[PDB]
Design an enzyme around this catalytic site. Structure first.
Site, short mmCIF file in Angstrom:
data_model
loop_
_atom_site.label_atom_id
_atom_site.label_comp_id
_atom_site.label_asym_id
_atom_site.label_seq_id
_atom_site.Cartn_x
_atom_site.Cartn_y
_atom_site.Cartn_z
N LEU A 3 -29.74 -80.36 -3.79
CA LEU A 3 -30.25 -81.66 -4.19
C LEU A 3 -30.33 -81.74 -5.71
O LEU A 3 -30.84 -80.83 -6.37
CB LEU A 3 -31.61 -81.90 -3.56
N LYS A 41 -31.70 -79.89 -10.59
CA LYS A 41 -31.34 -79.30 -9.32
C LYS A 41 -32.60 -78.75 -8.67
O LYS A 41 -33.34 -77.97 -9.28
CB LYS A 41 -30.32 -78.19 -9.55
N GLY A 66 -27.54 -82.52 -0.28
CA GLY A 66 -27.01 -81.69 0.79
C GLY A 66 -26.49 -80.34 0.32
O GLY A 66 -27.19 -79.60 -0.38
N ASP A 110 -19.18 -67.55 -7.36
CA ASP A 110 -18.99 -68.58 -6.34
C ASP A 110 -18.32 -69.82 -6.95
O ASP A 110 -18.70 -70.95 -6.68
CB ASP A 110 -20.33 -68.94 -5.70
N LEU A 135 -28.47 -87.66 -7.78
CA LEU A 135 -27.07 -87.61 -8.19
C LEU A 135 -26.21 -86.82 -7.20
O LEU A 135 -25.04 -87.14 -6.99
CB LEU A 135 -26.96 -86.99 -9.58
N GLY A 136 -26.80 -85.79 -6.60
CA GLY A 136 -26.13 -84.97 -5.59
C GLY A 136 -27.09 -84.53 -4.49
O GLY A 136 -28.26 -84.27 -4.76
#
Lengths: 104, 322
Positions: free
Chosen positions: B21, B37, B17, B130, B14-15
């Site tokens: 990941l 993740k 870099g 963050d 799904l994501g």
């Protein structure tokens, strides 16, 4: 792969432990479970379906169910341990020794 | 041949870099979807991992309508696998792209959702540290669910060679400088930058040169577009304020007239004795790697100072009352 929170808290309505089995037919899986059951002297069990068992470890006795279900991929299976009643701690322990049989 | 994280079958990515990941997981019995993740742990020290587990322990025990939920963490020698709630709405800034810029009222709606999640996490001692657009996910109903509370130290990076630094566009100057800082104050700043972006469709601080961008951030000077109403502008200036001592707190933000518009919890007590401590709760706690030291945990519960050990304890104790 170890779970950080598997012995911490249960947020789900049912307390459950899942095991994925990679390279064994249904017959091997059932044989592993029964072996583990018999290996535990304070535990009696019975067969309640072609794919499920009930067991009782004997303070309050731990009662639980064991279900085998086919996933969809070649054939992978999962075994689901469900606590019916009794202390979680003792349930986790018993499941560990069954699971160990299932994984080897 | 199929890879598994406990009961979850790994599927598509799904994501990838930067921001790490992420894989789709499918529960092999319930067919439920989760987002996993995947974080390389080789370079993370033990104390870093223990500190993160303590914070995640708390997150696993609280729930808010705008905080992405974590189900579990799995670990081997190279990787942590963070098993998270799956949402299907994409990112808040995808939305802002389509519109160019949000209505003040629409910006106020998402802003309240964020401040409310921050307030909830802060009051449980969890800062984000963050906060970024990537962390602002949308659900089925286009409500925000904030990702990555308690995970700033994981440093989920794009590259194994390059250490992940955080996104400087959204970072307060004290985080940029590598100083000690109040995580609550840093979240406020980041939250002001995000609000500016919602209203303007551009960033307060931006530059093609990285060193120049850092200077701009430390400087705190940015152009306030004139269409932004004057009460809203004063709120942005109170959040994007370089002096961390003068920077607005969440309580002042929620009392701000613009916040309000014009239409018109675990209780920490103290443990006097060890006889008062719940043995069942103690065993739950002791099952975590971050609490291998049984005596140190007791010291941490019996001490006067408020700490995350007590937060977990009482969260677990109350969970037990039900």
């Amino acid at each position: 792969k170890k779970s950080w929170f598997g012995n911490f808290i249960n947020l789900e309505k049912e307390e459950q432990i899942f095991v994925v089995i990679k390279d064994k037919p249904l017959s091997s899986i059932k044989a592993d479970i029964v072996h583990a059951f018999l290996s535990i002297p304070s535990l009696s069990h019975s067969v309640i379906s072609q794919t499920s068992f009930r067991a009782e470890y004997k303070q309050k006795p731990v009662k639980f169910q064991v279900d085998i279900t086919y996933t969809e991929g070649n054939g992978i299976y999962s075994v689901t341990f469900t606590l019916l009643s009794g202390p979680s701690r003792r349930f986790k322990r018993v499941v560990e020794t069954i699971q160990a049989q299932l994984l080897s | 041949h199929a890879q598994y994280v406990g009961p979850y079958r790994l599927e598509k990515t799904l994501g990838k870099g930067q921001t790490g990941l992420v894989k789709l997981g499918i529960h092999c019995v319930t067919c439920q979807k989760v987002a996993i993740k995947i974080v390389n742990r080789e370079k993370l020290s033990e104390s870093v991992l223990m500190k993160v587990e303590r914070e995640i322990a708390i997150l696993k025990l609280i729930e808010h309508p705008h905080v992405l939920k974590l189900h579990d963490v799995y670990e081997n020698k190279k990787y942590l696998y963070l098993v998270l709630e799956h949402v299907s709405g994409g990112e808040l800034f995808d939305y802002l792209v389509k519109k160019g810029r949000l209505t003040p009222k629409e910006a106020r709606k998402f802003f309240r959702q964020i401040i409310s999640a921050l307030d909830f996490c802060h009051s449980h001692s969890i800062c984000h540290r963050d906060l970024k657009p990537e962390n602002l996910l949308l659900d089925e109903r286009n409500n925000i669910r904030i990702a990555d509370f308690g995970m700033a130290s994981l440093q989920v990076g794009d590259s194994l060679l390059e250490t992940s630094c955080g996104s400087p566009h959204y970072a307060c100057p004290e985080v940029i400088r590598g100083e000690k800082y109040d995580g609550r104050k840093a979240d406020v700043w980041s939250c002001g930058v995000i609000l500016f972006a919602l209203l303007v469709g551009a960033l307060p601080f931006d530059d093609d040169n990285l060193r120049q961008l850092l200077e701009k951030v430390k400087r705190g000077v940015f152009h306030m577009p004139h269409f932004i109403p004057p009460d809203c502008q004063s709120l942005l200036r109170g959040m994007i304020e370089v002096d961390a001592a003068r920077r607005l707190t969440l309580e002042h933000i929620q009392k701000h007239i613009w916040y309000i518009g014009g239409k018109n919890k675990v209780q920490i007590r103290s443990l006097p004795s060890l006889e008062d401590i719940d043995p069942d709760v103690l065993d739950s706690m002791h099952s975590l790697g971050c609490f291998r030291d049984r005596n140190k945990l007791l010291q941490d519960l019996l001490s006067e100072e408020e700490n995350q050990e007590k937060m977990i304890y009482f969260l677990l104790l109350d969970r037990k009352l039900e």
